[PDB]
Coordinates of C-alpha atoms in Angstrom, one line a residue:
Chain A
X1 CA 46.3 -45.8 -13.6
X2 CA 43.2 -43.5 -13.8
X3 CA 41.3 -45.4 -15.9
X4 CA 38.1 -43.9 -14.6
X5 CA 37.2 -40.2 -14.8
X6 CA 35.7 -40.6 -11.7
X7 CA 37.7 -36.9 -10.4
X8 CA 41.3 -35.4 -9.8
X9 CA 43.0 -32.5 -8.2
X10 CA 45.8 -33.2 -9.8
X11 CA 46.2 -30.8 -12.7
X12 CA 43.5 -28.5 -11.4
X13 CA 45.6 -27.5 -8.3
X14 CA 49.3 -27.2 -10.7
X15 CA 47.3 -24.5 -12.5
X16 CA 46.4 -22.9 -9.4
X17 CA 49.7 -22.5 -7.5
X18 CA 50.8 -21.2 -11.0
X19 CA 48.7 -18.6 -10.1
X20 CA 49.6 -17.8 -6.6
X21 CA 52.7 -17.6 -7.6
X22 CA 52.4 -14.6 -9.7
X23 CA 54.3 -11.5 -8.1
X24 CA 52.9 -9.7 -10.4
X25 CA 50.4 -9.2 -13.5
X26 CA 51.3 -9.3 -17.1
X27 CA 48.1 -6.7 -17.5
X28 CA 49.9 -4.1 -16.3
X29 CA 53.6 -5.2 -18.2
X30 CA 53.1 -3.8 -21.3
X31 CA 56.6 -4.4 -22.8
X32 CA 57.3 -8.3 -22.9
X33 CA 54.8 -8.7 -25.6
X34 CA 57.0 -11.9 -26.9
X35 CA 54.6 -14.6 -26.2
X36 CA 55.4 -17.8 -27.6
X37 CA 52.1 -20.5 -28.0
X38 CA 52.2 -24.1 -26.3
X39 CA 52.0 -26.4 -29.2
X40 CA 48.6 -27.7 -28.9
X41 CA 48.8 -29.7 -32.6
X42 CA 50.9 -32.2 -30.5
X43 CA 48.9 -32.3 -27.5
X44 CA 45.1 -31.5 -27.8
X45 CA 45.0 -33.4 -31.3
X46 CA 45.4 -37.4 -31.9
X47 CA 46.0 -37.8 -27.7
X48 CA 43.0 -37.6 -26.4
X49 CA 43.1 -40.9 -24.2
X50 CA 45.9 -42.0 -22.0
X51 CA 48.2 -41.0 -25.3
X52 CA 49.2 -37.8 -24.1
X53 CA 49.8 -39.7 -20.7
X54 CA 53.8 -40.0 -21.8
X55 CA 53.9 -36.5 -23.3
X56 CA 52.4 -35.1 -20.0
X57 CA 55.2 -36.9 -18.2
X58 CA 57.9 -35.3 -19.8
X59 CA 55.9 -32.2 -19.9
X60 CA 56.2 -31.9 -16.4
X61 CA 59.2 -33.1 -16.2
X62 CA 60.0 -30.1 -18.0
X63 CA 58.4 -27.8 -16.2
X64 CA 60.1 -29.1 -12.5
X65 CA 63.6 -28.4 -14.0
X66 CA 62.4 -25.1 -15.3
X67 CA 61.1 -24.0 -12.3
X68 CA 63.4 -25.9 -10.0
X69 CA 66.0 -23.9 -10.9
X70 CA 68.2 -20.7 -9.1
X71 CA 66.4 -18.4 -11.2
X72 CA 62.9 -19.4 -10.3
X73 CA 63.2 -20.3 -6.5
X74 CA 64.7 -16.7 -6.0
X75 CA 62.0 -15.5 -8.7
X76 CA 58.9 -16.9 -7.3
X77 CA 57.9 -17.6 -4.0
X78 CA 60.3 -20.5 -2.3
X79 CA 57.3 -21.7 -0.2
X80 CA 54.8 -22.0 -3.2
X81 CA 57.7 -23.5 -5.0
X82 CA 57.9 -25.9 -2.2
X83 CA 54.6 -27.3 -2.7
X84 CA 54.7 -27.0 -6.1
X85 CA 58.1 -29.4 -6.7
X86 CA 56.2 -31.8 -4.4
X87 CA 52.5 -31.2 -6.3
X88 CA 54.7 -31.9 -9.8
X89 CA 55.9 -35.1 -8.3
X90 CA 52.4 -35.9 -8.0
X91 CA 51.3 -35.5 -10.8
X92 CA 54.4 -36.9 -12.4
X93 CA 54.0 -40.3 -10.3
X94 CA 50.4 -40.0 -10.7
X95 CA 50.9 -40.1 -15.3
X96 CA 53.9 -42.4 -14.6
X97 CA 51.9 -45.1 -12.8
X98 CA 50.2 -45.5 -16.1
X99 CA 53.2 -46.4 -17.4
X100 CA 54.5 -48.9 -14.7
X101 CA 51.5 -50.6 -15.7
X102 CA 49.7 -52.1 -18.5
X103 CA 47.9 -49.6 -19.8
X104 CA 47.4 -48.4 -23.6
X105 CA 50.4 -45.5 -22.5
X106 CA 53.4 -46.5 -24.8
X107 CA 51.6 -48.1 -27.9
X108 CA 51.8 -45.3 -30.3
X109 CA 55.0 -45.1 -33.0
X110 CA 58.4 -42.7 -32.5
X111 CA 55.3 -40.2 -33.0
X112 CA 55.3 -40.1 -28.7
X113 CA 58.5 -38.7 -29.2
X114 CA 57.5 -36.2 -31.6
X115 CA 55.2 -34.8 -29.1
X116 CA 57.5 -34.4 -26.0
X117 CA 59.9 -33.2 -28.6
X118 CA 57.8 -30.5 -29.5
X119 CA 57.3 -29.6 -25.5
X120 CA 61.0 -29.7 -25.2
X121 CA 61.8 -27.0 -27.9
X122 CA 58.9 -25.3 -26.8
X123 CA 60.6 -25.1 -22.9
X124 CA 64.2 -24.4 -24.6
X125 CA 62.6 -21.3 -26.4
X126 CA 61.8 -20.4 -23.2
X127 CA 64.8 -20.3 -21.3
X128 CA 66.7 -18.5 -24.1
X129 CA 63.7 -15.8 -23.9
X130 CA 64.4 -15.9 -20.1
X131 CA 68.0 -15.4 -20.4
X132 CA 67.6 -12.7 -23.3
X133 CA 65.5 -10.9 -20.2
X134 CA 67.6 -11.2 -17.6
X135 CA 65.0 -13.0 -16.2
X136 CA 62.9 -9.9 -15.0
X137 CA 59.6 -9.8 -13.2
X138 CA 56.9 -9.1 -16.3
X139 CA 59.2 -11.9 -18.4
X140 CA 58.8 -14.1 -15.7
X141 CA 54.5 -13.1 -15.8
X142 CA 54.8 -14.0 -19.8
X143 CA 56.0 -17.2 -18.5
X144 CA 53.4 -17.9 -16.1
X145 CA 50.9 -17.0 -18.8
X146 CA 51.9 -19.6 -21.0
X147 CA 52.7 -21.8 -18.9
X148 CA 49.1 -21.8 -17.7
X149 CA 47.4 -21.3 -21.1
X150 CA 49.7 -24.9 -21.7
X151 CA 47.9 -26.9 -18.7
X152 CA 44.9 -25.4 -20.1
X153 CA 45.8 -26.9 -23.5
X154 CA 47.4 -30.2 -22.5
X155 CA 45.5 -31.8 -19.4
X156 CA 42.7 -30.0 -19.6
X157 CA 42.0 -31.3 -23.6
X158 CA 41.0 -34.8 -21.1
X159 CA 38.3 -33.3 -19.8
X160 CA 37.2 -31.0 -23.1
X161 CA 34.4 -33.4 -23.8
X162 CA 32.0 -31.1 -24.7
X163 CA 31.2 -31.0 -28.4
X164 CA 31.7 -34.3 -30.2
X165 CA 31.1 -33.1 -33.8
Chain B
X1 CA 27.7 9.0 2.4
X2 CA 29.9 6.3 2.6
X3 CA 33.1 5.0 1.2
X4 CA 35.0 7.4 -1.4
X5 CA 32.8 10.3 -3.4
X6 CA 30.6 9.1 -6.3
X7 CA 32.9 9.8 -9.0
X8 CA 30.7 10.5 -11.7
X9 CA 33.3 11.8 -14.2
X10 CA 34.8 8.6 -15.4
X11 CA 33.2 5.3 -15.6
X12 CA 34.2 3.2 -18.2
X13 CA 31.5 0.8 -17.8
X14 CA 32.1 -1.4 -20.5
X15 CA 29.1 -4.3 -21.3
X16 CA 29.3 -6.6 -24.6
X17 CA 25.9 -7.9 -26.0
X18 CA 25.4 -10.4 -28.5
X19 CA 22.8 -9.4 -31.1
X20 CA 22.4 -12.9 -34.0
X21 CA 26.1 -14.1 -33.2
X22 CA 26.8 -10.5 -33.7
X23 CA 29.6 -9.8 -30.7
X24 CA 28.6 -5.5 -29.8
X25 CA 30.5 -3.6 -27.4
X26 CA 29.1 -0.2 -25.7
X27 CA 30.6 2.1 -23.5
X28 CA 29.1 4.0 -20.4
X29 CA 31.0 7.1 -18.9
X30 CA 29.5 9.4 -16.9
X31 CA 30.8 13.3 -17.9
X32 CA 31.1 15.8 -14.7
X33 CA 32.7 19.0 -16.3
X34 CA 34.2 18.0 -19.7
X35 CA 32.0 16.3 -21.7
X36 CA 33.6 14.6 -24.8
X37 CA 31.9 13.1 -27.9
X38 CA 34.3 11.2 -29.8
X39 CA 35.7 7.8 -28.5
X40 CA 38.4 5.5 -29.9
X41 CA 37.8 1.5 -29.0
X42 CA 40.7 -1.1 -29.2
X43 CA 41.1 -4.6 -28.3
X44 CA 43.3 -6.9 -27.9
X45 CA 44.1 -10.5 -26.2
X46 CA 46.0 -11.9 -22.8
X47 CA 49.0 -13.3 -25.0
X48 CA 50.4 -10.1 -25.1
X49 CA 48.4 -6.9 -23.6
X50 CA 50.6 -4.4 -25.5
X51 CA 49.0 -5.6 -28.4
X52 CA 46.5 -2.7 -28.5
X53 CA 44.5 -3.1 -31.8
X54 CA 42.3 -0.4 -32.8
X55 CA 39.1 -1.1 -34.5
X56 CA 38.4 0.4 -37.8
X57 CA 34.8 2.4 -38.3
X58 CA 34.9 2.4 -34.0
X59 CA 37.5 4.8 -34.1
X60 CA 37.5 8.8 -33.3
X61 CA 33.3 7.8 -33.6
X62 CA 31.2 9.7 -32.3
X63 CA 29.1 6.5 -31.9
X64 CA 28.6 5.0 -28.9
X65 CA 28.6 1.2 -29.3
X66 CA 31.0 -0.8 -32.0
X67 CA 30.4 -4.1 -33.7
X68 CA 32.9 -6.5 -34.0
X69 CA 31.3 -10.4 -35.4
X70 CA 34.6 -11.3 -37.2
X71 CA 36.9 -9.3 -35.1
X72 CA 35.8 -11.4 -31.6
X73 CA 36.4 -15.0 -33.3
X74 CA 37.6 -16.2 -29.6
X75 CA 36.6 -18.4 -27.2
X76 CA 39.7 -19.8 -25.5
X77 CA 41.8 -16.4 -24.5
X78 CA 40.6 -13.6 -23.3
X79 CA 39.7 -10.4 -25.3
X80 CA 41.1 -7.2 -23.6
X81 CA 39.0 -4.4 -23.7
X82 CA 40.9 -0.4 -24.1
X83 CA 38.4 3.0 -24.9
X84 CA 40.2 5.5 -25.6
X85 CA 38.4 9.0 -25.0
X86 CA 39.6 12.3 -26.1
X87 CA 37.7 15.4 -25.0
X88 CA 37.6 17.7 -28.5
X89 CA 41.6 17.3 -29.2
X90 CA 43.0 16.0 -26.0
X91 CA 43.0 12.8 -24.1
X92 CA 40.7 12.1 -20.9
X93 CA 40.6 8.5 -20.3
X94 CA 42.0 5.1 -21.4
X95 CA 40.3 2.8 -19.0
X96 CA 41.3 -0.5 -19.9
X97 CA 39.1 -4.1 -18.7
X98 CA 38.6 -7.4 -20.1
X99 CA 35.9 -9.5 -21.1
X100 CA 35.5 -13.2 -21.0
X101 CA 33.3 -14.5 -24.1
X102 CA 33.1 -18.3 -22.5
X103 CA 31.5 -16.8 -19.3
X104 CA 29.8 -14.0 -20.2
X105 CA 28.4 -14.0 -23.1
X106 CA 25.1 -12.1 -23.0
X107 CA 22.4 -13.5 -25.3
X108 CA 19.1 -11.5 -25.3
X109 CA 18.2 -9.5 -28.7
X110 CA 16.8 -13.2 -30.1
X111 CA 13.0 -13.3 -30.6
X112 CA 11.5 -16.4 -28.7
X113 CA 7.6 -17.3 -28.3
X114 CA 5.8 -20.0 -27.1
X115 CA 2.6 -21.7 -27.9
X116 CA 0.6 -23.0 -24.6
X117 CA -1.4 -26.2 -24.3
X118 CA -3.7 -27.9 -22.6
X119 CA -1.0 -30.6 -21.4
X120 CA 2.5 -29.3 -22.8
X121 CA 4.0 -25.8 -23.4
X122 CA 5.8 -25.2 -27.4
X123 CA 8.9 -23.0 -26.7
X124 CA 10.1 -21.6 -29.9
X125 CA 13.3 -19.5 -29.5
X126 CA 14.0 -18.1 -33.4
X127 CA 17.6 -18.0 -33.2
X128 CA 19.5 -16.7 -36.5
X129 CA 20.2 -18.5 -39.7
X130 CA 23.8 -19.8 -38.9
X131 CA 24.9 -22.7 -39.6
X132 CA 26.6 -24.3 -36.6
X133 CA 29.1 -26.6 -38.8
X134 CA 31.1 -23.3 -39.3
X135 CA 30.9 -22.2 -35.8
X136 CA 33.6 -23.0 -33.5
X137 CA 32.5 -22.2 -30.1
X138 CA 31.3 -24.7 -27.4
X139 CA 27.9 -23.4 -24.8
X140 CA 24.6 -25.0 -23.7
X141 CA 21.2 -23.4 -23.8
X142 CA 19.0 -23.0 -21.2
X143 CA 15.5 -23.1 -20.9
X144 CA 14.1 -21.7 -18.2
X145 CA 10.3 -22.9 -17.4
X146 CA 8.7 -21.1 -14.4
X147 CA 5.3 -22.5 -14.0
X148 CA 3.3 -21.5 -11.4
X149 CA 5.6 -20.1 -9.4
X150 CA 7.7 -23.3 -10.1
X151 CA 11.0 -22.1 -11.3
X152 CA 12.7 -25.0 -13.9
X153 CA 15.6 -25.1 -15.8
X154 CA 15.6 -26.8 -18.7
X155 CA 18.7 -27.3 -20.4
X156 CA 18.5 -29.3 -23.6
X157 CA 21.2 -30.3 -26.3
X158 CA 21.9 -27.5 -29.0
X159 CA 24.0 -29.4 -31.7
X160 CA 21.7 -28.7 -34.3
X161 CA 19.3 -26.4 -32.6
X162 CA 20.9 -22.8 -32.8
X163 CA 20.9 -23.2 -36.4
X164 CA 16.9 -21.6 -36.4
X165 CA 14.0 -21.6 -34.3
X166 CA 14.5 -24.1 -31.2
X167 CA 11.4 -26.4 -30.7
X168 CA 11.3 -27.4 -27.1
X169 CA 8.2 -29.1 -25.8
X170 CA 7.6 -29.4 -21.9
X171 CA 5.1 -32.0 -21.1
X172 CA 4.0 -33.2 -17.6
X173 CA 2.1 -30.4 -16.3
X174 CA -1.6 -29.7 -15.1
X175 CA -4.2 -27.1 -16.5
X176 CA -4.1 -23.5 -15.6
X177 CA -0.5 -23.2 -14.9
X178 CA 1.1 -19.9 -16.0
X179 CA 4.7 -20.2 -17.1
X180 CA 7.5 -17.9 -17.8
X181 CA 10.0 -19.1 -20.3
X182 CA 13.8 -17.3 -19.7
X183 CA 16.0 -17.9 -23.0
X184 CA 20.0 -18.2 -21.3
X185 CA 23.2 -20.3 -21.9
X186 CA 26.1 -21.4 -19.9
X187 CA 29.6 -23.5 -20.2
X188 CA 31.2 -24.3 -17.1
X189 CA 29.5 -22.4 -14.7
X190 CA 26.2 -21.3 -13.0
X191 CA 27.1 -17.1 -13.6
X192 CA 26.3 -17.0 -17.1
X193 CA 22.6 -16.9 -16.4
X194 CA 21.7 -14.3 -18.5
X195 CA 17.8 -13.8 -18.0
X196 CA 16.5 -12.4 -20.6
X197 CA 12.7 -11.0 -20.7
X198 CA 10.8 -13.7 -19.2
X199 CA 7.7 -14.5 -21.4
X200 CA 4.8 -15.4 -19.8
X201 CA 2.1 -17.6 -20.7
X202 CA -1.2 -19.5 -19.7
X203 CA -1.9 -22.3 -21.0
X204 CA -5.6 -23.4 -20.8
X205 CA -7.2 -23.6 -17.5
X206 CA -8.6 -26.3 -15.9
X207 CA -10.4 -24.1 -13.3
X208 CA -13.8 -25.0 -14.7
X209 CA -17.0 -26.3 -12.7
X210 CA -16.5 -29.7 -10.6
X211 CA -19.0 -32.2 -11.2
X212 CA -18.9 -36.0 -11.4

C-alpha cells in the first residue's frame, strides 16, 4: 500500500487521458446544460486518509464499466480507451493492494458503503442522462466534465493539504 | 507585415484585477469604424456554459469595468467570461473567454511599504480588513526581496497574515544593500507571479571610511 506520499502517476495520468479523449469541447455545446455534481460530501469529507481508499475502488470500478461499454469505445477514441481500461486497472490494483493488506482500509462502519453508494447512483444518473441523449457528442463532453471535476474532487482531496484550519 | 492583418476592430481583451478582495473585470476593444459605447457583461461557470448570467448594474453600462466581490465566490471551477457589445441598438460582438481565479488571480492595488535597517529590512504589505476565518480560498504570498541585484523570493505562511498589514522581517544582510520588495501570490504553480510595483529601498550604508 502507499503508505508514503512519496509521488504517483496514478490518478494524475486517469485525469489526463480523460482529456485526450475529448472529441470535442463542452465550451462550444451550448445545449446539454444538465450537469449533475460528483458528490463530494461522501468523498472529500471524513476520508481523507486511506478511507476513501475502498470508495475509490468502486469508484473506478464504476467508471471502467461506464466507459468499457459499446457506447463509449465507439464514442471515444478505441486506442485512448485502450490505455485507459489498462491505466484503470492500475489504479484499481494500485487502491486494492491496500486492501489485500493490513492497512487502516476497511475499518470504518456500513458508512463505506454509504459512500460507494452515493458514487453508484451518482454513475446510474448518468447513464439514464446518456440514454435520454442518445448518447450524442456534447452529452458525452458533459460527461467528461464531470467525470474530471470527480477525480478532481475524490483523489485529488489526498493531496489537498494546503490549508489546515 | 506578417501573419494575418492587425485587426483592430474587435478585441475582447478581457483582464480581472483584484482591488481589497474586490474581484473587477474590464474590457479592452479596439473600435475601427463603429464605435459603440454601451456594453453588457455576463458570466457564468464550466458546469454548464449555457448558463450565461448577466450581471446587474454591468449591464447596457456605459462603464467600462464591472465589480463583482460576491458574485465571483469561486475557487474550484472556472468562471466564464461573455461581453456582450451592441453598437447604439444592434449587436457587434459577443466574444466569450474564461478566467481562472486559482491561477490568475492578479493582486496589485494593496498599499505595501517597507522600513530599512541597518541589519534587517521591515516589509509591511497593508492588506484589507478581512477576516480570513470567513474566507474560503486557498493561495500563498510571496515576497519578493531583490537586494543588490540579488533577486529572492520569500514566501512566508499567510494564515493569519492577510487579515491586515503583513510584518515580514528579512535579516542576514550587509549595509548598503538596495532592495526591491515585489508583493505576489501563487497556488500550484510558478505563472501566477504577479509583480506588482517593485518598491525600492536602501537601507543604511556601510560605505563609510576604513580604518582600524
Amino acid at each position: 500500500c502507499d503508505l508514503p506520499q512519496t509521488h504517483s502517476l496514478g490518478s494524475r495520468r486517469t485525469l489526463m487521458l480523460l482529456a485526450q479523449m475529448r472529441k470535442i469541447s463542452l465550451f462550444s455545446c451550448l445545449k446539454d446544460r444538465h450537469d449533475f455534481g460528483f458528490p463530494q460530501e461522501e468523498f472529500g469529507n471524513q476520508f481523507q486518509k486511506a478511507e476513501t481508499i475502498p470508495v475509490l475502488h468502486e469508484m473506478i470500478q464504476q467508471i471502467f464499466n461506464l466507459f468499457s461499454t459499446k457506447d463509449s469505445s465507439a464514442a471515444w477514441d478505441e486506442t485512448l480507451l485502450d490505455k485507459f481500461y489498462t491505466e484503470l486497472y492500475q489504479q484499481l490494483n494500485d487502491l486494492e493492494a491496500c486492501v489485500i493488506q493490513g492497512v487502516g482500509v476497511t475499518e470504518t462502519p456500513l458508512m463505506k458503503e454509504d459512500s460507494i453508494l452515493a458514487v453508484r447512483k451518482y454513475f446510474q444518473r448518468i447513464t439514464l442522462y446518456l440514454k435520454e441523449k442518445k448518447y450524442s457528442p456534447c452529452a458525452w463532453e458533459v460527461v467528461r466534465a464531470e467525470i474530471m471535476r470527480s477525480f478532481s474532487l475524490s483523489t485529488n482531496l489526498q493531496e489537498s493539504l494546503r490549508s489546515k484550519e | 507585415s506578417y501573419d494575418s492583418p492587425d485587426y483592430t476592430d474587435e478585441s475582447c481583451t478581457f483582464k480581472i484585477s483584484l482591488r481589497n478582495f474586490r474581484s473587477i473585470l474590464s474590457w479592452e476593444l479596439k473600435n475601427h469604424s463603429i464605435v459603440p459605447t454601451h456594453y453588457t457583461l455576463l458570466y457564468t461557470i464550466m458546469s454548464k456554459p449555457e448558463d450565461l448570467k448577466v450581471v446587474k448594474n454591468c449591464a447596457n453600462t456605459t462603464r467600462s469595468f464591472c465589480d463583482l466581490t460576491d458574485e465571483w465566490r469561486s475557487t474550484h471551477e472556472a468562471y466564464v467570461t461573455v461581453l456582450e457589445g451592441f453598437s447604439g441598438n444592434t449587436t457587434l460582438f459577443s466574444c466569450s473567454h474564461n478566467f481562472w481565479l486559482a491561477i490568475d488571480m492578479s493582486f496589485e492595488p494593496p498599499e505595501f511599504e517597507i522600513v530599512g535597517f541597518t541589519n534587517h529590512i521591515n516589509v509591511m504589505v497593508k492588506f484589507p480588513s478581512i477576516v480570513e476565518e470567513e474566507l474560503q480560498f486557498d493561495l500563498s504570498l510571496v515576497i519578493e526581496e531583490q537586494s543588490e541585484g540579488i533577486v529572492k523570493k520569500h514566501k512566508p505562511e499567510i494564515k493569519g497574515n492577510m487579515s491586515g498589514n503583513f510584518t515580514y522581517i528579512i535579516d542576514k544582510l550587509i549595509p548598503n544593500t538596495n532592495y526591491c520588495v515585489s508583493v505576489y501570490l501563487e497556488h500550484s504553480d510558478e505563472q501566477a507571479v504577479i509583480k506588482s510595483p517593485l518598491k525600492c529601498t536602501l537601507l543604511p550604508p556601510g560605505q563609510e571610511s576604513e580604518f582600524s
